[PDB]
Amino acid sequence: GSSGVRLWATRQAMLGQVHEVPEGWLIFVAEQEELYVRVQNGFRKVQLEARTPLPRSTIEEQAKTFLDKFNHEAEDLFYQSSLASWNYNTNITEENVQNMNNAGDKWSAFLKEQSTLAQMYPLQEIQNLTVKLQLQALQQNGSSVLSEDKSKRLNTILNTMSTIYSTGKVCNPDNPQECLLLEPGLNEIMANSLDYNERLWAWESWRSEVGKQLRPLYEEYVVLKNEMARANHYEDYGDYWRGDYEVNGVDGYDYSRGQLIEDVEHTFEEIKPLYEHLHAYVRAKLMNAYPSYISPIGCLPAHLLGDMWGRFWTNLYSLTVPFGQKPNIDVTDAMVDQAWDAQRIFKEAEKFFVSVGLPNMTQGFWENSMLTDPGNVQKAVCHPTAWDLGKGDFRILMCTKVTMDDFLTAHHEMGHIQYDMAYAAQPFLLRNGANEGFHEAVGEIMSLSAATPKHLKSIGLLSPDFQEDNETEINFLLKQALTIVGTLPFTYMLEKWRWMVFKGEIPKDQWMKKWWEMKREIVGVVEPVPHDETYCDPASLFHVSNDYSFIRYYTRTLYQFQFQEALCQAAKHEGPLHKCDISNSTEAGQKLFNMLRLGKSEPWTLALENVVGAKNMNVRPLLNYFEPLFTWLKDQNKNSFVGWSTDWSPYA
Amino acid sequence: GNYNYLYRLFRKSNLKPFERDISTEIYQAGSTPCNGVEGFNCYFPLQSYGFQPTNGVGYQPYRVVVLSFELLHAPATVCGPKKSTNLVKNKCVNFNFNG
């Protein structure tokens, strides 16, 4: 059965000819602009909304044209900006310094103008999710939503703390002119020398010169960060950062900023028993090293963890090794045995990355990127960074040496750029990770797979005769727990600390004390010397002073654990999860590429569901990864009391 | 960036086959009149191509030539190479001298 639509100039003709209209034939009159449907023995009026004045130019069309025009030009401006930064990062020169000064000025002014242009394109009338999301990123004024003076002073205060952190130096009382910067003068001595006094003095001096000075600056920074957060419709600057994780308008995958806090708290609570076992054993090894400085029940000292913030216990791995007589897993000496260099490291990384089924990447990166420090004629930065220069240009900044640590970071760096060009089909705005905890997770998962002994034996890094006993597995698991699981409570709490600092729930005269209270009850670490609120120890973090959200690391850890578990499930791995390798598994790479190509256009919750199968994050891979270590810690906790004590202090 | 080349990103309608559009009119993306200048809902359809030695393989400047062949009532002019064989004599052969 088929029918159509009929028209009449006037309703008088409609009434006369309505008898000849078959059922299913629509009746329309232009005089009254009324629509009717022919029904059994009559016609039923079709409800019509307000008549639009033929708006053939919707905001959607104008926004799409504006977005396309912006993306085409923004690509070029960002491209040349990335080139200049790379040139400076490969050759530090005075002419290079002014290059990003001009490039950054043009890029910033261009970004604010496009943001200004997008301001008259409200998202309510926009139905395209991609268009709405891209313009929302465009309309993000940030510091410019407030007045110019508020933005100018916030930038000046931001520059002040960034400079202070960079120049943070402490001098020995006996030698006034002998002073050491935090990186690497302070960090090297505390990570190498195990002396309690020297570490305590460096910890105390660093927090006295920096904590006291940055306390008024941080409070003013927080106050201003709350000022434009509410101007950006956020209860605090913490909510402003949490807005990235928020997903709105996606049925079945919507995520809220408050949901992130609840899920992060839930994940930490269930993780806590594993962390308590690790903290107990690390404490147990601490009385083994220093019996008169750490209580069997009290919390760990702040300076006796290998990190002055208490971030990583990797420096304590030697001091807290499960078995100090069993040699560790390392094939760096085999690389120089086979005469390998940074070029071979990246070449083997690509061979591993094509063994997992993903296609080989172009030759432009190889000839446009350095893998070793360019001598001494030109100064270059060796920090691990990924260059998403755009226009199909991708580069890696790394002075990679012939070492396993550089081998893993090289794997980490190429995984970063391999995530970058995977979603090249996305527009310029959408050519980014779904969240801040995804780009690092991608580089971490396969670098660990490369570090697996099976991968080393497969490509000859490790001899096939190497024996894989539980002793080496336990030692490897503990090192992973110290480096990865150990930093989780510090990462969760500090972001929790900074969140209510922006919120203002904990008053200023309690922040640091609440931090140390949270360091004891939650982190299980106690400061070695009592201070006052003039100390601003959480602000001594690089990310706090440089305006970086710290939730990225805790989220990335659980994201990478979920990614690794899905990789092993796709590869049908059997046995311990820490020995699971994704090499020579084309299907695993294809499944990873299913979301690598997706990019940030889709919600990150959907991406997480596509990888593992759960829309929400979970700590299930953690238990599977560290089950042999969890049992070992439980067995070895006969003297390691599970947990900590808030009452005990190194000074009390 | 090799910005000599430009591309008609925007046009009022789809171009007909074998048609060249060179007009540099300011494209009106909205209902706001352009008045000969760009701005709100007004952009330049002939955006600039950017080509650099370090650009992506699919983003490199690619020289493309299309050779359409026209056969009409007019006599055929662009013929093929029409290769010729060797020469034999005093032998019963099947020859072909220009048809």
UniProtKB/Swiss-Prot annotation, chain A:
Changing residue 552 to Q: About 50% loss of angiotensin I cleavage but two-fold greater activity with angiotensin II. N-glycosylation on Asn-128 may limit SARS infectivity. Proteolytic cleavage by ADAM17 generates a secreted form. Also cleaved by serine proteases: TMPRSS2, TMPRSS11D and HPN/TMPRSS1. Changing residue 347 to D: No effect on interaction with SARS-CoV spike glycoprotein. Substrate binds at residues 311, 383-384, 553. Changing residue 113 to K: Increases slightly the interaction with RBD domain of SARS-CoV-2 spike protein. Its cofactor is Zn(2+); chloride. Its EC number is 3.4.17.23, 3.4.17.-. Zn(2+) binds at residues 412, 416, 440. Disulfide bonds join 171-179, 382-399, 568-580. Changing residue 75 to A: No effect on interaction with SARS-CoV spike glycoprotein. Residues 57-645 form the Peptidase M2 domain. It is found in: Cell membrane; Cytoplasm; Cell projection, Cilium; Apical cell membrane. Belongs to the peptidase M2 family. The extracellular region of the ACE2 enzyme is composed of two domains. The first is a zinc metallopeptidase domain (residues 19-611). The second domain is located at the C-terminus (residues 612-740) and is 48% identical to human collectrin. This is Angiotensin-converting enzyme 2. It comes from Homo sapiens. The gene is ACE2. The chain holds residues 19 to 614 of 805 of the full protein.
Curated annotation (Swiss-Prot), chain B:
The gene is S. Changing residue 55 to Y: In strain: Alpha/B.1.1.7, Beta/B.1.351, Gamma/P.1, Theta/P.3, Mu/B.1.621, 19B/501Y, Omicron/BA.1, Omicron/BA.2, Omicron/BA.2.12.1, Omicron/BA.2.75, Omicron/BA.4, Omicron/BA.5, Omicron/BQ.1.1, Omicron/XBB.1.5, Omicron/EG.5.1; May enhance affinity to human ACE2 receptor. Changing residue 10 to L: In strain: Omicron/EG.5.1. Residues 9-44, 73-95 are annotated as: Disordered. Changing residue 6 to Q: In strain: Omicron/BA.2.12.1. Changing residue 7 to F: In strain: B.1.1.298. This is Spike protein S1. Residues 1-62 are annotated as: Receptor-binding motif. Changing residue 55 to Y: Increased binding affinity to human ACE2. Changing residue 38 to Q: In strain: Kappa/B.1.617.1. Changing residue 47 to N: Reduced host ACE2-binding affinity in vitro. Changing residue 29 to V: Increased resistance to neutralizing antibodies. Binds to host ACE2. RBD also interacts with the N-linked glycan on 'Asn-90' of ACE2. Cleavage of S generates a polybasic C-terminal sequence on S1 that binds to host Neuropilin-1 (NRP1) and Neuropilin-2 (NRP2) receptors. Interacts with host integrin alpha-5/beta-1 (ITGA5:ITGB1) and with ACE2 in complex with integrin alpha-5/beta-1 (ITGA5:ITGB1). May interact via cytoplasmic c-terminus with M protein. May interact (via N-terminus) with host bilirubin and biliverdin, thereby preventing antibody binding to the SARS-CoV-2 spike NTD via an allosteric mechanism. Attaches the virion to the cell membrane by interacting with host receptor, initiating the infection. The major receptor is host ACE2. When S2/S2' has been cleaved, binding to the receptor triggers direct fusion at the cell membrane. When S2/S2' has not been cleaved, binding to the receptor results in internalization of the virus by endocytosis using host TFRC and GRM2 and leading to fusion of the virion membrane with the host endosomal membrane. Alternatively, may use NRP1/NRP2 and integrin as entry receptors. The lineage of its organism: Viruses, Riboviria, Orthornavirae, Pisuviricota, Pisoniviricetes. Disulfide bonds join 34-42. Changing residue 32 to K: In strain: Delta/B.1.617.2, Omicron/BA.1, Omicron/BA.2, Omicron/BA.2.12.1, Omicron/BA.2.75, Omicron/BA.4, Omicron/BA.5, Omicron/BQ.1.1, Omicron/XBB.1.5, Omicron/EG.5.1. Residues 2-10 are annotated as: Immunodominant HLA epitope recognized by the CD8+.
